[PDB]
C-alpha cells in the first residue's frame, strides 16, 4: 500500500518522529535559556561567524532538516512579530508537552484526549494569568521600574557587565521618545548606529541625531555652542557659464582666469550665506552657526566658510536632512536668493568626532528633537551584532511594558504558581471528565520545564530549588497571604521577584502559552506522514 | 501579428545562446526606433526553454503541454534542448527544468517541474504559469 | 506490461485500500491532522480532506480514478468528498476475499453491488425525516450548521437569510404530470455568483431577482430609469463597415476624407433604425459602438451599452429573454426582450449598478454583497457559496437523515436482514456492503478515542432492537440520540455518496488488467 518515489510513516511512527524532533529542538535551545545560558556559534561558510543567543535569530539563521523541527521553529517565530520574545520559552514548552503526551500515549491515552486536556489547561492558565498579573501605575517617575525591566531584559542577552551600560541607555532612549502622555510609542524614533575600532563598553546614548559626514577644513571649530542649523539644497561646487561655453586656450593661465570669472556664481551665494550668518547672532556671545549643505561644496567655499568661524558639512544623505528637519527644526532652502533667518534652526553643542577611517558630527542637545540615537561601539563584528541585538530587545521590552501596563513577576514564579494552580483547580473541578486528567497532568508538568531549565543552566540542582520554592509557597498559602516566590539563580535559594527586580511581560507569557499549546495540539494530532510531489 | 513561432523548436548546444539570446528583439513596426539605435523601445520575446530527459515522467508530460501551448500561443517561443546537452554534468535531481527568458534576460528558473502544478500536469497548470 | 489472473484485481483493490486508508481519519469534528511533505523542505499540517486528496500523488491508475471521482464530487455535491472514497475502499476491501478466496466472478459482485445500491437508497429514503422547506425559520436553523463556528460566525444571522433568499430565488418549486418534476433546477455556479460591493454591512446585503450589470451609461445624456424596459442584444458593431475582402480607401483632396465619415453615418443610421424598429429601450452590443450610433439610438429614446462581455448577455437572455442576433439587418421584432422589470441604476457604496430584476422565475439571480473590507467580502463570498450548496442539497429533497453514522448503521442492519432472505450466491456481496457501511461509525469512534469494538457493538444492538436515530456523539464519543443532540446531514448527500461509492467500486472491479498503449 505505497507508491514509488514516496515515503510515509504508519501506526505511531509519525508521533515518535515528531516527538524526537521536538526533543532535539528543545535540547538545541535548552542551553540558551535564562541569563545563565550559553551562546551558539553559527558559521555561514563564507568566513562570517555569528555568536548569538536570541532564540528568534538562532532559529531564523540556522538550517533545520527535520520537517517537524522546521514547523516548530516557524510557529515559534510568530512570537517575534507579536511580542518580540519568548521563542525559547515556546520551544521548551512544546518539547516538554510533547514528551509528556508521548509518555501518556505509550500508556494507551488517545491523542485527542490529550489535546482536550491541553485546551482545558490552557483556559485555566489564561484565567490564572488574568488573576495573577500586577497592574503598573501611570506615574511619570517610574524610571526605577523601567531600569529594572531593562536590566531584566539585558541580563538574558549580555555578559552581565554591559548591563550597567545598556540599561540606562535603553531606559532613557525609550522614555524620551514616549513622554508621560497617552500619545503613542514608535521605536522608529530611536536610531541604531554601529562604530568600529572602539571598546564594547564605550556604548553611549545621544539625545539627538548623529551625522555621518564631517568637516573637511582644519580651521572649522571643533565645537560650536548654541549653533543655528542651516539646511541648503543648492550645490556650492564650482559652477560654469549658464550658457554654452568651454575652455579653449594656449596656456593654462587663460583657463585659470576663466575659472576665476565663473566662480562669481558660487561667490554670490556664499556672500548671501555669510550675510545671513552675520545678521543672525553674528557677534552675540554664546552663539554659533552651522550649515548642513546637503549638496557638495567646493574647497574654496569650504575655506570661505571656515574663515568665518562657520562649521559647514557637505554631501549628506536625504534621510539625514529629513531627520534634521525635525531634530533641529530648520528648513531646507531650495534657493539662496530666498534665504532668510526663518530657515535657521537651533541646536545645542555641535561636536565633530575624528576616527581613523571616518569622521562623525554630533547635532544633539535639541529643544524637542522628537528622536534619539544610540551609538553601538565595538571592535569585532560579533560584539557589535550582540550589542545591537541586546539594545533592540531591551527597547522592544520596555516599549511593551510602557504600552501594556500589565506586569507579571518573573524568576520562574509564574510558571510554578500556574502549575500548582492547575494541579489543584483542574483536579478539584473535573469539569469535562476523568479521562482528561492525563492531559491536565501532562500540561501541568510541562509548564514546570522553564524553572527546571533555568536552574540546570545556573548549575544548581533543579530538585532542591523546586522543593524550596514549593515549601515557601505552601507556607505562604498556610499563612493566608499573597506572596510571589521565585528562583535566585545566583544564590540557589528562593527569592521574591518583586523585590529583586525580575519581571516578565504579560503579552509575552500569554502568547508563549497559546503558541506552545497550539503547536503541541497540532503535532500530537498528526496521525501519519505523507509524501507527494516527487 | 506577427504570428512568429507556432511550434516547439529543437536546440543543439552550439545554438543555445543564439536561439535563447534572440529573445532580445522585436521586429519592424512592432515598436519605436531612434537615432543610431534600431532596437525597439518595447520588450522582446518570451522564450520558454525546456531542459528535458526522455526517461523522466514530467519530461514526457511537458513535451505534450509545451507543444499544445505552442499551437495556441503563436507569439510565444518554445524550445527544447536535451538537458544533458545544455549543462555540463546536468544533474537528474533538477530534472526537468524550465527557464523563462525575456528581452534576453532570465525571468523564471523552475526546477523539478513535477511540483509546478499537479504531478499529472494539465494545460490548466501550464496556462496558469504562462500568465504569470 | 500485462497482468493476468487475480493479480490485476488484487493490485486494483490494494490501490483503492491505500487511497481510502489515508483519509480514513478525515471524518467527524475530531478528525486527526496529517503531514504533507513535499520533496523540498516545506510541509503543512492541513486536515482538509479535499486538500489531502488533492496534494497526494498516486501512481496506480485506480488511485488516480478514485482521486478524480472525489474531485468531481467536490463540485457536483457540497459534501461527501472523503465519504465517497472511504465507502468505496471499504466495499472493495470487503468484496476482495470473495473474488480472491471464494473464486466469485466479478460480474456477480457487480450485479450484487448494484442491487445493494438500490436497497441502500430505499433504506435511506425510509430512515430520512421531513423538513419544512417553506418555513424560513427551519431553513435558517438547518443552514446555520454550515455557517456557524466559522469566520462568518459574526454575521451568521444575516448570512443564513441571504443564502436562503438566493437559493429560493433560483429555486423553482413546480410539480405536475405534464412537464414532470424539474428538481428545482438549482444552478449556483453560473447564475448565483456573488457581487462584492465595498462598504456597508452584511445586514445591508440584498438578493436581486435578476442580473446586475456594472456597465454604466455610455453617454451622460441618456435615460437612467425605464419603467417599461425592453432589452435587445446584438453582436455586430455600429460603426464604419468595410468589405469582406481587401478594402482600400483612396482620397485625393484632403476635404474628401469626410466621405468615410458620411458613409459611416449612413450605415450607422440604417443599423440604428433597424434596431429601433423593434421598439427597444436598451441596446447592448458586444462589439464597439461608435459615438454616432450612440447619438442615433438616443434619438430613438433608448439607452446604449457597448463592449459588453458575452457573460453578461448569457444571463440577460435568461432573466430578460432578449434574443441576440449577430447581424443588425437580421434583427426581428420577436427578438425584443419584453417582460423586463426595470433599468434602475441606483448607486450603492459609490459603485455603479444596473438592475434587471423582475417578479418572474428565470432560475437566475445576483447577490449584492456588502462588507467593510475586501477580506471580509471574500470570506463571506466563500461562506455563502458553501451555505448555498448546503441549502441546495437540503431543498432538492425536503428531508434529512440522522448524522453520526446512524444512517450507515441502519443501512447495514437492514441490508443484512434483507440479504438473509435472498437465498442466492449473491448474498455474500450484500453482506460485504452491509459490513463496509460500518466504516463511518468506526471512524467516528476511533476519532473520539472510544472503544472501537464495544461502542460499535452497542450501537449495532441499539439499531437492531431500538431506533435508527442513535449515533456517535462528536464530543462525548458515546452512543446518543442524534435527534436530541441535533446531529443531522442532508439525505441528498447520503444518497449521492452511497451511489457514487458503489458505482466506483463496480467500475474498478470491471477492470481486470492494465496494458500499455498509446
- C407: nearest Cα among C476, C461, C473, C488: C488
Distance CA A473, CA A467 (A): 10
Q: Which residues of C touch B120 (CB under 8 A)?
A: 64
Q: How far is A63 from chain C (nearest CA, A)?
A: 10
- A379: nearest Cα among A395, A355, A363: A355
Q: Which residues of A touch B112 (CB under 8 A)?
A: 534
Q: Which residues of A touch B115 (CB under 8 A)?
A: 533-534
End-to-end CA distance of chain B: 22
Interface contact flag, C40 B120, Cβ < 8 Å: no
Whole-angstrom CA distances from A115 to A118, A283, A359, C57, C446 are 5, 79, 61, 30, 15
Q: How far is C517 from chain A (nearest CA, A)?
A: 21
Grid coordinates representing C327 are: 447581424
Q: How far is B25 from chain C (nearest CA, A)?
A: 31
Tell the CATH topology of A1-136+406-534.
GROEL; domain 1 (1.10.560)
Cis geometry, peptide bond prior to residue B96 (ω within 30 degrees of 0): yes
Q: A333: which residues sit within 8 A by CB, 6+ positions away?
A: A230, A231, A232, A233, A234, A339, A343
Catalogue the active-site residues of C. 48, 81-82, 386
- B22: nearest Cα among B48, B51, B44, B42: B44
Q: Which residues of A touch B93 (CB under 8 A)?
A: none
Nearest beta carbon to residue A70 from set C34, C41, C52: C41
Distance CA C392, CA C187 (A): 9
- Which residue in chain C is spatially nearest to B121 when comparing CA positions? C57
Distance CA C199, CA C349 (A): 6
**Contact at 8 Å (CB) between A157 and A385?**
no
Q: How far is A522 from chain C (nearest CA, A)?
A: 7
B93–chain A Cβ distance below 8 A for any pair: no
Q: B18: which residues sit within 8 A by CB, 6+ positions away?
A: none
A10–chain C Cβ distance below 8 A for any pair: no
Task: Give strand pairing partners of A204.
Answer: A375
- B96: nearest Cα among B77, B76, B117: B117
Q: How far is A5 from chain B (nearest CA, A)?
A: 12
Q: Which residues of A touch C22 (CB under 8 A)?
A: 528, 530
- C127: nearest Cα among C385, C403, C325, C361: C403
Classify burial at A287, counting beta carbons within 10 Å of its beta carbon; exposed 0-12, middle 13-18, buried 19 or more.
middle
Interface contact flag, B114 A532, Cβ < 8 Å: no
Interface contact flag, C38 B120, Cβ < 8 Å: no
Residue C250 φ/ψ region, left for φ over 0, alpha for ψ in the -120 to 50 degree band, beta for the rest? beta
Distance CA A504, CA A406 (A): 9
B119–chain C Cβ distance below 8 A for any pair: yes
Q: Which residues of B touch A533 (CB under 8 A)?
A: 114-115, 119
Q: Which helix (H) or strand (E) holds C164?
A: helix C156-170
Chains that touch B (3 or more CB pairs under 8 A): A, C
Longest CA span, chain C = 102
Give the helix ranges, DSSP H, for C342-405. Answer: 374-395
Distance CA C153, CA C386 (A): 14
Question: How many C-beta atoms surround the C-beta of residue C143 within 10 A?
Answer: 24
| DSSP secondary structure letters along C231-264 | EEEE-S-BS----SS------SSGGGGHHHHHHH
Residues C318-357 as b/e (b if ≥16 CB within 10 A, e otherwise) read bbbbbebbeebeebeeebbbeebbbbebeeeeeeebbbbb
**Contact at 8 Å (CB) between C210 and C341?**
yes
- Which residue in chain A is spatially nearest to C34 when comparing CA positions? A526
What residues in chain A have their Cβ under 8 A from chain B's Cβ atoms?
A: 532-534
Count Cα atoms within 13 angstroms, Cβ side, for A61.
Answer: 17
**H helices, E strands: number in chain A:** 19, 19
Chains that touch C (3 or more CB pairs under 8 A): A, B
B92–chain C Cβ distance below 8 A for any pair: no
- Which residue in chain A is spatially nearest to C474 when comparing CA positions? A112
Q: How far is A532 from chain B (nearest CA, A)?
A: 9
A527–chain C Cβ distance below 8 A for any pair: yes
Q: C462: which residues sit within 8 A by CB, 6+ positions away?
A: C470, C479
Distance CA C146, CA C213 (A): 30
Task: Give strand pairing partners of B77.
Answer: B47
User: Dihedral sign, CA of A264, A269, A274, A275?
Assistant: positive
Q: How far is B24 from chain A (nearest CA, A)?
A: 35
User: Dihedral sign, CA of A287, A293, A297, A301?
Assistant: negative
- Which residue in chain A is spatially nearest to C14 when comparing CA positions? A1
C39–chain B Cβ distance below 8 A for any pair: yes
Q: Which helix (H) or strand (E) holds C37?
A: strand C33-37
C64–chain A Cβ distance below 8 A for any pair: no
C25–chain A Cβ distance below 8 A for any pair: yes
Chains that touch A (3 or more CB pairs under 8 A): B, C
Interface contact flag, B115 C57, Cβ < 8 Å: no
User: Dihedral sign, CA of C374, C376, C380, C382?
Assistant: positive
- Which residue in chain B is spatially nearest to C58 when comparing CA positions? B119
Q: A259: which residues sit within 8 A by CB, 6+ positions away?
A: A238
| DSSP secondary structure letters along C303-340 | EEEES--HHHHHHHHHHT-PPEESSGGG--GGGSB-S-
C330–chain A Cβ distance below 8 A for any pair: no
Q: Which residues of B touch C38 (CB under 8 A)?
A: 115
Q: How far is C34 from chain A (nearest CA, A)?
A: 5
Q: What is residue A32's three-state secondary structure?
A: coil
Q: Which helix (H) or strand (E) holds C488?
A: strand C488-490
Distance CA C370, CA C216 (A): 20
Cis geometry, peptide bond prior to residue B2 (ω within 30 degrees of 0): yes
Interface of C with B in 157-216 (CB under 8 A): none
Q: Which residues of A touch C25 (CB under 8 A)?
A: 527
**Contact at 8 Å (CB) between C272 and C297?**
yes
- Which residue in chain C is spatially nearest to A64 when comparing CA positions? C41
Name the phi and psi angles at A135, rounded to 5: -85, 125
Resolution of this entry in Å?
Answer: 4.6
Whole-angstrom CA distances from A202 to A163, A386, C326, C427 are 12, 14, 84, 91
Cell numbers 452590443: residue: C285
Interface contact flag, C39 B119, Cβ < 8 Å: no
Whole-angstrom CA distances from A230 to A310, A344, C73, C196 are 11, 5, 74, 53
- Which residue in chain C is spatially nearest to B120 when comparing CA positions? C57
Indicate which of C38, C39, C51 best probes the interface with B, i.e. most B CBs within 10 Å of its own CB: C39
Q: A261: which residues sit within 8 A by CB, 6+ positions away?
A: none
| Angle, in degrees to the nearest 10, between helices C61-76 and C491-510 | 160
C57–chain B Cβ distance below 8 A for any pair: yes
Q: Which residues of C touch B112 (CB under 8 A)?
A: 39
Q: Which residues of B touch C64 (CB under 8 A)?
A: 120
B33–chain C Cβ distance below 8 A for any pair: no
Q: Which residues of C touch A526 (CB under 8 A)?
A: 32-35, 45
Distance CA C449, CA A246 (A): 93
Proportion of chain A in helix, strand, coil states, percent, rounded to 5:
50, 15, 35
Name the phi and psi angles at A453, rounded to 5: -65, -40
* Order of strands, sheet of C194-198, starting from the edge strand that comes earlier in the sequence: C194-198, C366-371, C206-208
**Contact at 8 Å (CB) between C152 and C382?**
no
Instruction: Domain A137-207+370-405: give its CATH superfamily.
Output: TCP-1-like chaperonin intermediate domain (3.30.260.10)
B55–chain A Cβ distance below 8 A for any pair: no
Instruction: Domain C210-357: give its CATH superfamily.
Output: GroEL (3.50.7.10)
| Angle, in degrees to the nearest 10, between helices A67-76 and A13-30 | 50
Distance CA C499, CA C172 (A): 25
Grid coordinates representing A412 are: 520562574
Q: Residue ranges per domain, chain A? A: 1-136+406-534, 137-207+370-405, 208-369
Amino acid at each position: 500500500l505505497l507508491n514509488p518515489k514516496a515515503e510515509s510513516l504508519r501506526r505511531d511512527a509519525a508521533l515518535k518522529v515528531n516527538v524526537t524532533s521536538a526533543e532535539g529542538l528543545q535540547s538545541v535551545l535548552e542551553t540558551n535559556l535564562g541569563p545563565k545560558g550559553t551562546l551558539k556559534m553559527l558559521v555561514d561558510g563564507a568566513g562570517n561567524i555569528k555568536l548569538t543567543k536570541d532564540g528568534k535569530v538562532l532559529l531564523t539563521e540556522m538550517q533545520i532538516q527535520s520537517p517537524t523541527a522546521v514547523l516548530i521553529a516557524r510557529a515559534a517565530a510568530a512570537q517575534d512579530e507579536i511580542t518580540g520574545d519568548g521563542t525559547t520559552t515556546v520551544v521548551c514548552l512544546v518539547g516538554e508537552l510533547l514528551r509528556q503526551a508521548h509518555r501518556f500515549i505509550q500508556e494507551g491515552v488517545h491523542p485527542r484526549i490529550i489535546t482536550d486536556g491541553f485546551e482545558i489547561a490552557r483556559k485555566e492558565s489564561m484565567k490564572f494569568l488574568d488573576e495573577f498579573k500586577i497592574s503598573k501605575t501611570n506615574l511619570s517617575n517610574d524610571r526605577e521600574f523601567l531600569l529594572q525591566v531593562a536590566r531584566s531584559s539585558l541580563l538574558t542577552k549580555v555578559d552581565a557587565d554591559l548591563t550597567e551600560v545598556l540599561t540606562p541607555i535603553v531606559t532613557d532612549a525609550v522614555l524620551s521618545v514616549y513622554d508621560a502622555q497617552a500619545d503613542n510609542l514608535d521605536l522608529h524614533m530611536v536610531e541604531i548606529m554601529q562604530m568600529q575600532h572602539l571598546s564594547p563598553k564605550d556604548t553611549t546614548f545621544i539625545k539627538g541625531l548623529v551625522l555621518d559626514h564631517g568637516g573637511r577644513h582644519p580651521d572649522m571649530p571643533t565645537r560650536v555652542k548654541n549653533a543655528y542649523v542651516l539646511i541648503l539644497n543648492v550645490s556650492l561646487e564650482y559652477e560654469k557659464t549658464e550658457v554654452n561655453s568651454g575652455f579653449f586656450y594656449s596656456s593654462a593661465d587663460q583657463r585659470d582666469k576663466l575659472a576665476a570669472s565663473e566662480r562669481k556664481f558660487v561667490d554670490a551665494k556664499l556672500k548671501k550665506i555669510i550675510d545671513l550668518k552675520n545678521e543672525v547672532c553674528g557677534m552675540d556671545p554664546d552663539k554659533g552657526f552651522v550649515i548642513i549643505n546637503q549638496k557638495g561644496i567646493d574647497p574654496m567655499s569650504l575655506d570661505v566658510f571656515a574663515k568665518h568661524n562657520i562649521l559647514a558639512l557637505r554631501r549628506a544623505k536625504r534621510r539625514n536632512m529629513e531627520r534634521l528637519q525635525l531634530v533641529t527644526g530648520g528648513e531646507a532652502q531650495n534657493s539662496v536668493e530666498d534665504l532668510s533667518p526663518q530657515i535657521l534652526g537651533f541646536s545645542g553643542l555641535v561636536y565633530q568626532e575624528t576616527i581613523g577611517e571616518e569622521k562623525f558630527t554630533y547635532v544633539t542637545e535639541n529643544t524637542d528633537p522628537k528622536s534619539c540615537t544610540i551609538l553601538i561601539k565595538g571592535s569585532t563584528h560579533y560584539a557589535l551584532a550582540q550589542t545591537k541585538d541586546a539594545v533592540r530587545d531591551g527597547l522592544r521590552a520596555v516599549a511593551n511594558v510602557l504600552k501594556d501596563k500589565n506586569i507579571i513577576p518573573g524568576a520562574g514564579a509564574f510558571y510554578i504558581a500556574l502549575s500548582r494552580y492547575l494541579r489543584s483547580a483542574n483536579m478539584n473541578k473535573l469539569g469535562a471528565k476523568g479521562k482528561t486528567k492525563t492531559g491536565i497532568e501532562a500540561f501541568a508538568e510541562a509548564l514546570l520545564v522553564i524553572p527546571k531549565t533555568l536552574v540546570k543552566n545556573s548549575g544548581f540542582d533543579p530538585l532542591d530549588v523546586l522543593a524550596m520554592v514549593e515549601d515557601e509557597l505552601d507556607d505562604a498559602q498556610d499563612s493566608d497571604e499573597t506572596r510571589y516566590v521565585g528562583v535566585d539563580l545566583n544564590i540557589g535559594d528562593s527569592c521574591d521577584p518583586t523585590i529583586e527586580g525580575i519581571w516578565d511581560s504579560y503579552r509575552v507569557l500569554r502568547n508563549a502559552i497559546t503558541g506552545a499549546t497550539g503547536i503541541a495540539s497540532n503535532l500530537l494530532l498528526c496521525d501519519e506522514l505523507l509524501r507527494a510531489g516527487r | 501579428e506577427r504570428s512568429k513561432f507556432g511550434e516547439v523548436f529543437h536546440i543543439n548546444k552550439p545554438e543555445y545562446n543564439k536561439e535563447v539570446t534572440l529573445a532580445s528583439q522585436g521586429k519592424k513596426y512592432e515598436g519605436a526606433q531612434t537615432n543610431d539605435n534600431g532596437e525597439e523601445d518595447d520588450g522582446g520575446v518570451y522564450v520558454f526553454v525546456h531542459l528535458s530527459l526522455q526517461s523522466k515522467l514530467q519530461s514526457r508530460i511537458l513535451s505534450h503541454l509545451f507543444q499544445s501551448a505552442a499551437c495556441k500561443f503563436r507569439e510565444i517561443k518554445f524550445v527544447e534542448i536535451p538537458a544533458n546537452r545544455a549543462i555540463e554534468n546536468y544533474p537528474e535531481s533538477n530534472c526537468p527544468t524550465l527557464i523563462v527568458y525575456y528581452r534576453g534576460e532570465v525571468i523564471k528558473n523552475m526546477i523539478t517541474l513535477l511540483e509546478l502544478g499537479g504531478n499529472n500536469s494539465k494545460m490548466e497548470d501550464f496556462e496558469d504559469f504562462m500568465v504569470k | 506490461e500485462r497482468t493476468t489472473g487475480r493479480q490485476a484485481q488484487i493490485s486494483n483493490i490494494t490501490a483503492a485500500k491505500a487511497v481510502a486508508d489515508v483519509i480514513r481519519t478525515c471524518l467527524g469534528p475530531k478528525a486527526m491532522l496529517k503531514m504533507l511533505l513535499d520533496p523540498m523542505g516545506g510541509l503543512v499540517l492541513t486536515n482538509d480532506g479535499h486538500a489531502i486528496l488533492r496534494e497526494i500523488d498516486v501512481a496506480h491508475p485506480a488511485a488516480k480514478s478514485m482521486l478524480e471521482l472525489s474531485r468531481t464530487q467536490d463540485e457536483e455535491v457540497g459534501d461527501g468528498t472523503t465519504t465517497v472514497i472511504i465507502l468505496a475502499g471499504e466495499i472493495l476491501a470487503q468484496c476482495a476475499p470473495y473474488l480472491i478466496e471464494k473464486n466469485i466472478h466479478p460480474v456477480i459482485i457487480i450485479q450484487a453491488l448494484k442491487k445493494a445500491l438500490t436497497d441502500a437508497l430505499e433504506v435511506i429514503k425510509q430512515v430520512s425525516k421531513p423538513v419544512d422547506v417553506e418555513n424560513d425559520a427551519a431553513m435558517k436553523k438547518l443552514i446555520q450548521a454550515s455557517i456557524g463556528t466559522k469566520y462568518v460566525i459574526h454575521w451568521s444571522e444575516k448570512m443564513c437569510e441571504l443564502a436562503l433568499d438566493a437559493v429560493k430565488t433560483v429555486r423553482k418549486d413546480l410539480g405536475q404530470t405534464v412537464e414532470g418534476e424539474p428538481n428545482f433546477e438549482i444552478d449556483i455556479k453560473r447564475y448565483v455568483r456573488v457581487e462584492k460591493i465595498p462598504g456597508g454591512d452584511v445586514l445591508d446585503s440584498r438578493v436581486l431577482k435578476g442580473v446586475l450589470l456594472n456597465k454604466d451609461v455610455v453617454h451622460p445624456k441618456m435615460s437612467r430609469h425605464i419603467e417599461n424596459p425592453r432589452v435587445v442584444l446584438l453582436d455586430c458593431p455600429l460603426e464604419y463597415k468595410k468589405g469582406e475582402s481587401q478594402t482600400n480607401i483612396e482620397i485625393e483632396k484632403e476635404e474628401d476624407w469626410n466621405r468615410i465619415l458620411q458613409i459611416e453615418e449612413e450605415q450607422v443610421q440604417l443599423m440604428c433604425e433597424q434596431i429601433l424598429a423593434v421598439r427597444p429601450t436598451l441596446v447592448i452590443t458586444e462589439k464597439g459602438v461608435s459615438d454616432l450610433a450612440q447619438h442615433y439610438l438616443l434619438k430613438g429614446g433608448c439607452s446604449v451599452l457597448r463592449r459588453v462581455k458575452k457573460s453578461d448577455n448569457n444571463r440577460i437572455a435568461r432573466v430578460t429573454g432578449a434574443t441576440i442576433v449577430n447581424r443588425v439587418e437580421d434583427l426581428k421584432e420577436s427578438d425584443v426582450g419584453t417582460n423586463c422589470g426595470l433599468f434602475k441604476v441606483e448607486m450603492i457604496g459609490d459603485e455603479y449598478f444596473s438592475f434587471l430584476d423582475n417578479c418572474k422565475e428565470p432560475k437566475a439571480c445576483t447577490i449584492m454583497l456588502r462588507g467593510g473590507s475586501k477580506d471580509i467580502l471574500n470570506e463571506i463570498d466563500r461562506n455563502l457559496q458553501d451555505a448555498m450548496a448546503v441549502a441546495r442539497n437540503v431543498m432538492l429533497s425536503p428531508s434529512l437523515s440522522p448524522g453520526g453514522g446512524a444512517t450507515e448503521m441502519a443501512v447495514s442492519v437492514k441490508l443484512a436482514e434483507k440479504a438473509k432472505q435472498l437465498e442466492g450466491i449473491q448474498q455474500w456481496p450484500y453482506q460485504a456492503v452491509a459490513d463496509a457501511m460500518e466504516c463511518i461509525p468506526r471512524t467516528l469512534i476511533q476519532n473520539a478515542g472510544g472503544d472501537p469494538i464495544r461502542l460499535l457493538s452497542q450501537l449495532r444492538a441499539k439499531h437492531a432492537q431500538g431506533n435508527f436515530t442513535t449515533g456517535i456523539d462528536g464530543d462525548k464519543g458515546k452512543i446518543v440520540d442524534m435527534v436530541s443532540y441535533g446531529i443531522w446531514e442532508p439525505e441528498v448527500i447520503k444518497q449521492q455518496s452511497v451511489k457514487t461509492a458503489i458505482e466506483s467500486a463496480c467500475l474498478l472491479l470491471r477492470v481486470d488488467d492494465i496494458v500499455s498503449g498509446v
